[PDB]
Symmetry: T
Subunit: 136 residues, 12 copies
C-alpha cells in the first residue's frame, strides 16, 4: 500500500542539532519500502496549517499516515481535530525519548485520537509505524 | 451592512462524523442558509475558511477597512491561539465568537477560550443557528 | 409555545451600576422589551426572579409540566451551584444559560459555569439581547 | 541474542473483558505468535509474568547476566512504580516499555509513565504487535 | 555586521487603537529609526514581519546562512510556540527576544516565554529602545 | 429511637431518568420500603426533603431535641456546602452521609464531600439499600 | 446612625461546642452586650440571623433604604457564596466582614473569603469584640 | 452464598494503637464476629489478609471461580494501587471497598480511592460494622 | 498597659504615592493620632518601624519583657516571612496583624498571610483606624 | 540493644554505577563496616534487604518483638508507599529513614518522603555514613 | 545624569565559581568598566552592594532625593522579595531590573520576578553588558 | 579542625515552647554540650546566631577563609531563602543543614528546603543530636 510520512516543524533540521539528516532517513525508508512492496510519499512543513491541509487531503489518496509533528505535538489541538476528522489510521512518531527531556514534551495532545504512538526508538520508529499500519 | 463570517481549522469538515454533536449539515449547507438569511435580512455577508492561524489573523487585520463586524468560529484555535486574541484586540470592529457543539460537555481543554475575553461575547452549543444569532447581535449594535 | 425566563440572585439589581458592563436597563425594562419581543413572535413568556438557589431549583422541576423551554440567567450561582446543575439535568426541556456581561473579561471565578455542561448551550456578553437570542434558539428547537 | 518479555500485574487477564480496547486474544496466544518469529531469526525469547512489583524488580536485576534486552509491559505499575524505574536504571541492557491499548485515550492517570524516562523508549496503542516491534527495535540495537 | 529583525503576529499593528494626533509609533516608524541607528554603528539590518508562525520558523532556519544574529519579537507566540523555540535551538546564531511593553504588568499568560530558555536573553518593557539595546548586545558578541 | 431521613436538592426527582445509575424506583418508592423495615424493627423514621440548603440546616439544628440520629442524602450539596458541614458539627447526634449512585465513577467534582469529614461516615454506590444500611449502623451504635 | 448586624448560617449555634475556638457566650449573650454597648454610644442596631443564603441577600438589598452600614458574619458562606459577594457590590453602604474565631488557624477552606474583596474590610480572630470593633469603624466613616 | 473478606497491609495490626480511630478490637476479634454473623444469615465467608499488593491481586483474580462477591479493605493501597484497581475491573464479581476509620477526617492523602471508581461502592467510617453492612449489600445483589 | 506598634518595610512610605487605597496621612500623622488615642484610653504605646525582617524579629523577641501586646503591620513580609511567623509563635504576648488597605481587592499574592495563623487575629482594609481597633482589642485582652 | 538495618528495592545494586552521586561501597561493603562498629557500644545489628514492599512491611511488623530500633532505607518506595508509612506508625519502635545520595539535588519526585512524617527523623545525602549516624541517634534514645 | 547601580545578595561573589554561566569577571571588574563607560557618556554612577534585603529597600527609599534612575540586580531576591517590589512602587524614579545569566535556562524558581511588574522593565541573559544597556535605557528616557 | 555552627532566626528561642518537639534545652545548653563534645575528639567549633538573613549570608561568604565546614540551622528561612541557597553554592566548603524537630510532621510549608539541593545533605527530626551527627559527617570531608 501507500502511506504518507508527514513531518512537522524543525524535523527538516535533524543533524545540525540521529546522526542522520531527514534526507538520509527518507532514503532509507524509500529503500525500506521498495523491499516490502509498499509506496510512501513524504511531506514536511514548518506550517501547522500545511499539516492540517495534508491530513484532510490524505483521506482520498493514502491508507495510513505516519506523523512526526515536532513540538506541535504538545499544543496543537487543531492538528488533533484534523486527525479525528479523517478515517485513516495515524501513528504518532518521535525519534528522541521525549520523557527524558523537558517536561512540556511529556504530553501529546494528538495521541489520544490517533491509533497510537512511538517514542524514543530513533528513525527506526518510522519503519515500525509503517509495519503496524501494514497490519491494519 | 456587511459582515465577515470567519471559520478556522476543521470547520470545513462539518458533516463527516458525529452529527448529534455538530449537526447533519456541511459548511456549504450552512453557508447556503446564511445566504437566504442574509438576503431576507437584507444585509451582506462574506465567508472565509482556512486551516492556517495566520490566514485568520491576516483577515481580522484587513477586515477593519471592509466590514462592520466579524462572526468568528476559530475551531480549536479558541483554546490556545493568543495570537488570534491579540488580532481581535487590535481592531475596532465587534467580534462574536461562535461554536456549534456544546464545548462544556466535551473535553476539558475545550472549556476555555483565550479569544473570548477580548471579543464582544460568545455563543456556544446552539448549533448552526448560533451564526444567525451572532449576525443578529451585530445588526442590533 | 410558552417559555420561562428564570433569573437568579442579584439580577433584580441590574441598572444601578456600571452601564458599560451591564447596560442602563433595569430588569423591569428588559422584561417589558421581551414581552414586546414575545408578542411579535406569537409566543408566551413567564418571568420569575429570586435570590434563593432553592426557588430556582423548585421552578426548574415544576417547569417540565408547563413550559417548553427555559432561558436561565442564574447570576453568580453559575459558578458553583451544582444543585442547579443537577436540576437542569433532571428535566427534559431545553435550557439556555444567559449572561449579559462578558464574564471572560471579568474576575477569573466567573470564567466557568457548572451549569453549562448539561444545558443546550450558553450565550455570554451580548447584553440583554442575549435573552432574545436564547428565545429564538428555543423557537428553532 | 536472547530477550526477556516481562509482563506485570493483570497482563495475564487479556481476555476477561473488552476486545475493542485490548484485541481479542489471550496472553498465551500472544506468546505463541511471538515464538514463531524468533526461531526464524535465531532469536530466543523467555516470557515471565507476575502480579507482584518485587518479582519484576527481581527479574530486571537478574536479567543483566542472561539477556541482551527486555520488552516490558508493566501493567498499571507504569504510572506509579518508581521502584521499577530505579531497577531499569540500574542495569545496562536496553529496555522498551510497551502497552497494547491507547492509554492516551483512557483515564487520565494512564497518561504518564514513571518508567519511560529511563527506558530506551515506549510503544503505546499498537496492540499485541507492539511486542514484535519492540523486539525488532532491540535487533536494530 | 548584518542582523535580522524578525517580528511576529500583530507587531504590524503597533499604534492601532491610538487616535493619531499623537499617533503612537508604528512599526514603520520603528524601522526608520532602526535603519538610522544601524547606519550609525555601520551595521546592516533586514526587517521581516509576518502573522504566520511557519514563516517565522522558515526565516529562523534560513537565517544561519545570511545573518550573524536575530532580534525576535514574536508577539504572543512567545507564550506558546514551542515550534519557534525548537527553530531557535536548531541554529547557531545568537537570538535576543524583545517585547516593547512590560508584559509582567499585563495578563498572567504573558508572564512566561517558551522561547527565552534557548535564546541568549530577553528584553522586556523598555519600549522600541529594546530593539536597539538588543542590536548593541549582538554587536558586543 | 427515632431517626430523621434528610434528603437534599433533586433527591425528589429519583426516577426522572437513568435507573442504571440511580435505580428504577422513586423517592416515594424508597420511603415506603423504609417504613415497612422500621415498624417491623420497631422503630420510627421521619422523612423530609427540600431543595433549599437553608431548610436542611434548619432541620439539622432542630433534630437535636427530637431524633437520635440522621441519615443525610444532601444531593449535590455534598460537594460544596460548608454551611451544611458546620451544621452537622454543631449538633451532638451521629449523622451518616448516603448517596445511591457510585459517585467515584461519575464527574470529578462529585468525588469529594465537604460534609463527610465531620460526620460519622459515608456510604456511596450501594443504591437505595444504603439508606437501610445507614439506619442499621445508627441502630447498632444504643439510639 | 443605625446599623444592621447580619449573621449567617450556624452563627445561632455559638455555644453547643468548642469554647476555646468560639468563646462560651451565645448569640443572645452577644446581642445583649451590643445592645448595651449601643445604648451607651447613642446608636441604633438591628440584628437578623438566618441559615438561608437568599435571606442574607434579600436583607442586603433591602438594607440600602434603612441603614447606614452592615456588619456581616456570614458563617461558612464567606468561603463560597459568590451570590452574597455580588449583593454586597450592588449596594452603596459600607459592609465589614467579621469572624469570631481565627480562621487562619483552622481548616484551609476557611482561609479565603470570596466576600471580602468587595467589602470595606474584614476582622478575624478577635472574638465577639470584633462586632464592636466593626461598629466603631462604621461610626468613624 | 459465599464471599471473600480480603484485607490489605496493616489491617492485621488493628489494635497496637488508637481504639478511638480504628476500634479496640483486633482483626481476629472482627473475624470471629463476622463468622458468627455469617452463620446467622446463612452465608459462608473466607478471610484472607496480606501485606503484599501482589497477593491481593492474585486472590482477586482467583475469586471469580469460587466466590460470589468480595468485601475489600486494602488499607493504604486504596490511595495509590492502580494495579488493584485494574484487578477489580478484570473480574465479574461485585466488590465493595470498606474502611473502618473515617478517612475524610484524617490526612489528605486518605481522601481519595483509586479503587472505588470501578467497585460497586464504598463504606467509610462505620467501624467494623462496615464489613457486615458490605456483606448485607452483597446478599442484596 | 503598654503596647508596641511595630511597622515593617515600606510602611514609612504611606503618602509618597496613591492615597486612594491606604489614605493621605503619613506614618507620622498616624503615630500622632495614636499618641492622642493612647492618652485618651490612658495607656502607653511605643512605635518602631524598620525595613529589615531581622529588626522586626529582634523587636518581637525583646517585646516579651517590656510590653503587654503588639500591633504588627509587617508590610509585604506578611505574604512570605515564615521567620516572623515563628517569632510571633515563640512569645507569649497577644499579637494583632493590621493592614490599612483592603488586600483582598489587590494583587493575589497579598491575599494570604503566613503570620496570621499564629497571631490572635487580623484586621484588613479599615485604614489607619485598624491600629486603634487592634489597641482596643488588646485592652480587652 | 539490637537494631534492624532494613533496606528496600534496588539498594542491593549500590556501587554498580555512579560513585559520585552514589559513593562506592557495595551494600556488602557497608554491612561489613557497620558490624565491626557494633562490636563495642555492645550492640547487635541484623541486616535485611528485599525488593518487595510487602517483605519490608512484614519485617516492620515483626520487628516489635525483637529489636529496639530500625534504620530504614526504603529506596524509591519512600516517595509513594503509604503502606510502609502505616507499618511504621503501627509499631512502637523508633525508626530513622536514611538515604545516601542527596535526593534534593535529583529528580523532583524524590523530594518528598511519605514515610518521614511518622518516623523519628530522616538523614539524606550523607553517604553510607548516614547508616552509622542513624545508629548513633538510636543509641542516644 | 547620576544613576544608582544597586546589587543584592551574592552578586559580590561573581567569579569565585562559574564564568561559563555568569561571565569571567568579578563585580570589581564590572564596576571598573561601568565607571569608564560612565566617563565617556559624561555620566555619574554610584555603586552599592549588600546581602541584606533591608539595605536594598533603605537604598531604594533614599534614592529618590539623589539619583534619577536605579539599575537593580537583586540576585535571588527577585523571586520572592515582595518587600523590594513595594519599595520600587513607592518611589518615582525609573528602575530597570537586570540579571547576567539567562535565568530561563536555569532552575524553575528563577523564571519569575516579583519585582519586574512594577519596574520599567527587565534585561536577562546578556551578561555584564546588561548593566550598560539598562544605563542607556535610563539615559534614552 | 575548625567548623562553624550557624543558627538562624528564632533558633535562639529554643526552650520557650513545647518541650516534646523542641526539647528541654536552650541554645546555650546545646552550645555547651557541643563544645564539650568537640573537645573530646579534638576539633574546634565557632557558634553564631542571628535573626537576619543577610547576617547568615555574610557569615557563609566569610567562612571560606576560616573554617573547613558549616553546620547550618536556618530556622524557617530554610523554606523560602533562595538568597541563602545561592550563598551556599557560591562557597567551596561542605554544608550540612540541620533541624531539630521532625519538620515532616508539622505544617506543610516546612516540608521543603530550598537550601538542601545545593548542600551536602540534611538531617531532620533527631533533635540536638543532629548537630553532633552533622559534625561527625563533616569530619569525613
Amino acid at each position: 500500500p501507500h502511506f504518507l510520512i508527514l513531518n512537522g516543524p524543525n524535523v527538516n533540521r535533524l543533524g545540525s542539532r540521529g546522526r542522520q539528516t531527514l534526507t538520509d532517513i527518507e532514503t532509507d525508508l524509500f529503500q525500506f519500502a521498495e523491499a516490502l512492496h509498499i509506496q510512501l510519499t513524504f511531506f514536511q512543513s514548518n506550517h501547522e496549517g500545511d499539516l492540517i491541509d495534508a491530513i484532510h487531503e490524505a483521506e482520498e489518496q493514502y491508507s495510513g499516515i505516519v506523523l512526526n509533528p515536532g513540538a506541535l505535538s504538545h499544543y496543537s489541538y487543531a492538528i488533533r481535530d484534523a486527525v479525528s476528522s479523517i478515517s485513516l489510521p495515524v501513528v504518532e512518531v518521535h525519534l528522541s525519548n521525549l520523557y527524558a527531556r523537558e517536561e512540556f514534551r511529556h504530553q501529546s495532545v494528538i495521541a489520544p485520537v490517533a491509533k497510537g504512538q512511538i517514542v524514543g526508538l530513533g528513525a527506526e520508529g518510522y519503519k515500525l509505524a509503517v509495519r503496524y499500519l501494514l497490519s491494519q
